[PDB]
Structures are given as structure tokens and as C-alpha cells.
Design a protein around this nucleic acid. Structure first.
Lengths: 50, 143, 37, 100, 53
RNA sequence: UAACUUGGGAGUCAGAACAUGGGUGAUAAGGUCCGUGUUCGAAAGGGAAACAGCCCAGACCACCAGCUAAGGUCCCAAAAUAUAUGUUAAGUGGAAAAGGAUGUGGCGUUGUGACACUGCGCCGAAAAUGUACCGGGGCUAAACAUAUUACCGAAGCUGUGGAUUGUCCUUUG
RNA sequence: UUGGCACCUCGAUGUCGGCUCAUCGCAUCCUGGGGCUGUAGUCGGUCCCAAGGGUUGGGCUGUUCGCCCAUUAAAGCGGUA
RNA sequence: GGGAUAAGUGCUGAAAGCAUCUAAGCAUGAAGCCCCCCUCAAGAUGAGAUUUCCCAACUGGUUAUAAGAUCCCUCAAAG
């Protein structure tokens, strides 16, 4: 089927309300100091210690 | 040029109570919708609700003229195919009089946002009692 | 009964009456029983 | 303490020291104009209302004389190529109210 | 119209089976035996009542 | 207050509804074809709920002024819970005939019964998504019929200001 | 239903019969309650109120209809382009 | 199985000395209506209720933290 009527740019931005993407869910490494991704291995420096 | 307009700062609202004993449904409903809508004040403005707060009691004691106790069916549809339901003024004056009164009066108010907000000024009670003692309910009578 | 839109006495004991607005004829022959004037 | 006068085919309720915008009088700038048609006076101390009142007639300055904001009168007929636009600015005079 | 029969999520509802029988009641295990088969999966909560009929 | 002639420039040749006089059709049709008038066409505003053609009435413009027309006055919704007298119990009002019938009132002739007009009601009266033939609530008067009083109600008319054309010359205003 | 008109649609509103899915009316086929029979009983006839639920499988034929075989409490009549 | 009913069946009862189920009154009477059975249901904005939990420190108020809930992770009777 075809759209019978173009979408007003208010309805477009209403539909795009939930199209946001979420944070990565990250923590501070207790060895690296830099940030890691929880339950993952520190890309920056070394081990996982779990 | 000059003509008064009431504000949210300007309006005061009084409470009233009125027995329905010996009353006819429509003859009470008219005189009460007038008070709810607030067109017995001198400072009537159309856009704000200068009405009052009305209490109705003894709603089990209203009357019906002629053969309306068994005639005068109330219909209502549930929006499901074949979902139409039916009741009678007899089976509602004794089963739920405080919705009989509500419907009768609320069909008399305009069907807008101000009217929706003015309909909830009405507090209907069967029997001669009401929990609204802390309001200083003034005693009105019809005419 | 006999529900017809013309109720009228057939014999002479058949007497015309009203019940609930409906016109009827009450008679002794139950054949003559009629309503809906 | 107010008075009801009638000036331009319209009654007006006026008090002492009030600005009024009336339609275009025949007076000039500054010069005072006294209304003769009074219909009511009262408010606070006396109450005289009659078919008309002879006396205590309002003495009022003539403050300004001008033209109101331009309304643009427009009217059209749909599917019939018939539209019309006029402009309009209604002349008025504003008076200050001295005495009643 | 409403109450149209279209595809959607199935099962899950609260369902009640009436007029079932109590085969046995085994104390020392707190178990009850019911003629038939009650709703829900295994490990699922069920509430018993005496039939209102 | 037009009429006519002489010239320049046209558009129009699919009309509609309603009221009335007809043909055709079936005393069908929002049918069709003629005469007659109006409205629409090319007409906005008030009323008929909404509703080109029905009723009132013809918008130069502005005003938070007044009187009214059709239509109305219990609430939605501005204005009579008006006044006097009567009718109607069916929610008739607020859809439909032949026919039926100790419904109810009026007047009338008859020797307690019978009839002649008669006003208003009853039955006849069954349809398709949802009450669903008062716009709704509601109404036994807020229905009906008659009769005086008021008031509401338009862009009508009047009031005040203004803009244009005209024609009298009160008096070039 | 067979029509009569020619009001909407010819810069496009897709026909019939089946299938899937239904839904509504009642002028009721079944079941429910009654009156009257020219109703002895089993069974009827015909009216009245009633729309809750139900209302089959095949042969032939594109077919609807229809005729037939076999059951069924019954194998309802219609609207919804 | 209760309540109110349709067509019908009446009792009492006059207007109409009588009779008359109706006008006042009083019953009875359907797979039908309203409950009873089963399910959703307080966004029911009329947003209901009941029990238990938490309830300080600085400046009109702010703050984070409390009870609690998640992020992330292992899953399935759920998807």
C-alpha cells in the first residue's frame, strides 16, 4: 500500500521519540582506572579479576 | 470597551443542598443545571465557571409522571457488536437513583471541557445524608 | 383467542370489553374469544 | 460616583478622572467639551436616573484626536473568482473627564 | 468490530476447572490427588476450592 | 422612472427546486414535457437540528448602541416554569389507510336507553451496525385549541463616524 | 425480485458460484410458554409471546435455484456493495 | 436456583344495582431480561480500599540517600 497523505513533521518526531539509544552500562576498572564495560575484560590494561 | 470579566482570582463558589422529595426528575434537573452552570450570579462569564457546588439528597424519593415507571427506557451501547443494554426508570429509581439523577442533570449541561468540569460540581446522594458537612452547605429551595 | 383487527360479537352473549387498552370480546363459546379491537 | 452619558449613539459610564475613547467629535485638540446628554448619575452619594437629567453635565477635556489601528476587511467567494479587500481606520477622540 | 478474532498472544490466562474430585489426600507429604488435569505448567501455583455448585 | 432609435462590445442556446394549471406515467418518482410566479444560478445573514431551490431578509465600512421579521421563551441556548378558559393518558404530541370499538368532551333530536353531527384520542402498526420518526435531556404541561399581554431574535431599519459616485444650485455647501 | 427514472461515479467504485470469517433483523424451522379446534390418547392444524442457543453430509450441475440419496430436534426466510 | 416480566391464567372490584382479569389493589406466568457460573477490570481522571515498610541534614526550598527498583550478568515454567 501507499501513504495516502504525507506525514507531518510533528508526527515524524513523535514516532521518533523512542528511537533513542541507551548508555553502554559501563563501570570504572579497579585496576585500569579507565572505564570498562561491566562483565567484560578491560581493553586498556590487562585482566578481569573475577 | 468596558464590560466586566470574572477571573480565577475573582470567583467565589457556594455550596447548596436540595431535597428531591416530592420532586419531578426534569423539573428539578432544570433548576439545578442552572445553578451548576452558574447563570444566576450577576458575574456570569461564559468562559470560566462561576457556578456553585450542588448537593442533592433523598434521590430515592423523586417522582415520575404518568407511565414512566415502566416506560422511559435507558439504552446504552458497549461498542461491541450486539452490545446494547436496556434499563427502566423503575428499575433504576430503586436500584441506582444517584445515577438517574446524574444523567438527567448532566444531559442539560453543554458538552465541552467547561461543561465536563461543571458536571462534577454535582454531588448526588440517596437518603437524607451526605459526607459534605465541612463545607457549610447552604439550604436552597427550588421555584 | 382470535387476534383480528375487527373484533365484534358473533352470537349475542358475546360482550365487548376493554383490557389494557386492547378491545376484546368475552363470550361463552371459547371460539368467540377475541381481542385487538 | 459615576454618570451614564450618551454621546455617539452609545451610552458610556464615566467617573471623575477617566480616559474615554469616543467617536470623532467636532472639537479640536485641547479645547474642552461638555456633554449635555446625561442619563444617570449616582454611584455613592446621590441617585438620580430619569428619562434625562438637566444639570451636573460632564465637563471633559479633549485629549487626543486620531485614527485607530488599520483593520483589513477581506471577503471572497469560493470557486467564483470574486474577492475584495478594503482597508479601514476608524477615527476617534480621547477625552479626559474633569467634572460631573 | 470489537471482539474480532485475530492473531495474538495465546495462553497465560487464569483458567478454572470445575467439579473435580479428590482421589486421595496423602499426609506425610502434604499431597493431594485430583481426578483429571489442572491448568498451568509443572511447578505452577494452583489454588483449590470447594466447588460452589 | 423609465421607453425608443441609431451605432461599439458581449456572454447565453446542459438549467434546478418549490407553489399552482395540465399532458405522459400507475391521480409512481428528487420522473418527464409545457404554461405561471418566486428563490438558486449570480445571494451573504436569521429560522427549518445539520440541509443550493422551503420561510424571513437583499452585506459600502466601523461601533462591547436601539426597534423589529420568520421563528420562539424549562436546561443545552438569548427571552414567559406568562395570563384565561377548556381538551387529551397515548409520551398522542414527536410518521401510515380500509376496517373495528360501552375512550372521553360538546351541542342536538328520541321514547333510563337510540341515533346525527362532532373535537381530541385507541387498535390496525413487522427490518436488517446503535436507542435511532421530539436534535438531546427531560416534559402530563415544557402537548393541543382559542384570546389579550410582554420580551428575545438578522449583516433588515434607526443611531454615530467614515469612503465613494451621482442629482437638485435651500444656499456650489 | 422483475422493472421505471437517470441523481453520484467513465483522469477506472472489479462480475457470478464456492472457501475463510462472520454479523444483524424477525415475517420463528427446532427447543421454551400459551389460547382455540371439526383437541378421546400418540400426532396434528392455526393463531399469540419469544431472537438465548442451534439450524448436516453427499450425487448432478460454473451455477444461485433445483431434483435426488441418507440422517436430523430442525435441515428457517432475509440485510450487510 | 432467586427478582421483574411477555402472550396467557386469574382473585378481588367498581364506572355500568348485573356481570367484568383493571380503573385502585393483589398474585401467578417463558430456553427470554437482571443476578447466580467463568474471565478482564481503579487511566472507574468518581484514578477506590486494606496490611506492612521508609520518614533528615543544611537552608522559599536543595540535596543525595532510605524503603524499593533497575543497569549488567546466569536462565526458563515466560518470550
Amino acid at each position: 500500500a501507499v501513504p495516502k497523505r504525507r506525514t507531518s513533521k510533528t508526527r515524524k518526531n513523535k514516532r521518533r521519540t523512542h528511537f533513542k539509544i541507551s548508555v553502554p552500562g559501563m563501570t570504572e576498572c579497579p585496576n585500569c582506572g579507565e572505564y570498562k564495560l561491566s562483565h567484560r575484560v578491560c581493553k586498556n590494561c590487562g585482566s578481569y579479576n573475577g | 470597551r468596558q464590560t466586566f470579566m470574572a477571573n480565577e482570582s475573582n470567583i467565589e463558589r457556594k455550596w447548596y443542598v436540595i431535597d428531591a422529595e416530592g420532586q419531578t426528575l426534569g423539573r428539578l434537573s432544570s433548576e439545578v443545571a442552572s445553578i451548576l452552570r452558574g447563570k444566576n450570579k450577576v458575574t456570569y462569564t461564559p468562559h470560566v465557571d462561576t457556578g456553585d457546588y450542588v448537593i442533592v439528597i433523598n434521590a430515592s424519593k423523586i417522582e415520575f409522571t404518568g407511565n414512566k415507571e415502566t416506560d422511559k427506557v435507558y439504552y446504552r451501547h458497549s461498542n461491541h457488536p450486539g452490545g446494547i443494554k436496556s434499563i427502566t426508570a423503575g428499575e433504576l429509581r430503586r436500584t441506582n437513583p444517584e445515577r438517574l439523577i446524574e444523567n438527567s442533570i448532566k444531559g442539560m449541561l453543554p458538552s465541552t471541557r467547561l461543561g465536563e468540569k461543571q458536571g462534577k460540581k454535582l454531588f448526588v446522594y440517596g437518603g437524607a445524608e451526605h459526607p459534605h458537612a465541612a463545607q457549610q452547605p447552604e439550604n436552597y429551595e427550588l421555584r | 383467542m382470535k387476534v383480528r383487527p375487527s373484533v365484534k360479537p358473533i352470537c349475542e352473549k358475546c360482550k365487548v370489553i376493554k383490557r389494557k387498552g386492547k378491545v376484546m370480546v368475552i363470550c361463552e363459546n371459547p371460539k368467540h374469544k377475541q381481542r385487538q379491537g | 460616583m459615576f454618570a451614564i452619558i450618551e454621546t455617539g449613539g452609545k451610552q458610556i459610564k464615566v467617573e471623575e478622572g477617566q480616559e474615554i475613547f469616543v467617536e470623532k467629535l467636532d472639537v479640536n485638540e485641547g479645547d474642552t467639551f461638555t456633554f449635555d446628554k446625561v442619563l444617570f448619575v449616582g454611584g455613592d452619594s446621590v441617585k438620580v436616573g430619569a428619562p434625562t437629567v438637566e444639570g451636573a453635565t460632564v465637563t471633559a477635556t479633549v485629549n487626543k484626536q486620531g485614527r485607530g489601528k488599520k483593520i483589513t476587511v477581506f471577503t471572497y467567494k469560493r470557486r467564483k473568482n470574486s474577492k475584495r479587500k478594503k482597508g479601514h481606520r476608524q477615527p476617534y477622540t480621547k477625552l479626559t473627564i474633569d467634572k460631573i | 468490530f470489537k471482539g474480532q478474532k485475530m492473531p495474538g498472544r495465546m495462553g497465560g490466562n487464569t483458567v478454572t476447572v470445575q467439579n473435580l474430585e479428590v482421589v486421595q489426600v496423602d499426609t506425610e507429604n502434604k499431597v493431594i490427588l485430583v481426578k483429571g488435569n489442572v491448568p498451568g505448567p509443572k511447578k505452577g501455583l494452583v489454588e483449590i476450592r470447594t466447588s460452589i455448585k
